[PDB]
Structures are given as structure tokens and as C-alpha cells.
Amino acid sequence: AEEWYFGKITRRESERLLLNPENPRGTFLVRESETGAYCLSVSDFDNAKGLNVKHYKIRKLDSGGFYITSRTQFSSLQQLVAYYSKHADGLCHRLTNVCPT
């Protein structure tokens, strides 16, 4: 889709948005790599940090495939997002909600 793609937003700006207290665990957004790669930022919770944000680097295979882990690849970012919204499979939490505002 297009709604979860926040483009050129910084890491700190994405964290300010994801730290929203009304955000369910697993709220996310995809952005451009700040450090042509992408990044999946997801909200999470634990007692030590409270609400926090995890950042996953979306890498590209030399053959043309998007991936975060070393056993799963996707033909597009939409397919990657669809996959992780159904299965956590290595991520802190599965994707549950597109980040508001």
C-alpha cells in the first residue's frame, strides 16, 4: 500500500510518532534508510523501557528481493508488510496497526 510508507522521515521523528500511547503494540511505519534501503519501525512494550520502538533494516538481495531475516524474501515492500502483519517470525511483535498522524 501507500499509507504505511512515511518516506523520508528521521529515526527520531518515527519514534515520536510510534511512542503515541494510543498505539497498540505492533503499530508501524516504513521509511527510507537514514544510515536505497528501507526501515520498518515498530512499537513495543516491556516493563524496563515501557513503550519503545524497534527498528528493522530492510535489505535487498542482489537478485532483487526484500528481506529483514535470513530465510524469508519478498518481491515488494507491500508483500513484506502483509507477511509480518500475519506472522511475527523473528520480529518483536507482528504488525498490527499503521502509525497514526
Residues near Cl ion (CB under 5 A) are 34-35, 39, 57
Pick between residue 35 and residue 70 the one whose CB is nearest to Cl ion: 35
Pick between residue 55 and residue 93 the one whose CB is nearest to Cl ion: 55
H helices within the chain, ranges in order? Answer: 11-18, 77-84
3-state class of 16 per DSSP?
helix
Pick between residue 10 and residue 79 the one whose CB is nearest to Cl ion: 10
| CB of 55 vs Cl ion, minimal distance in Å | 5
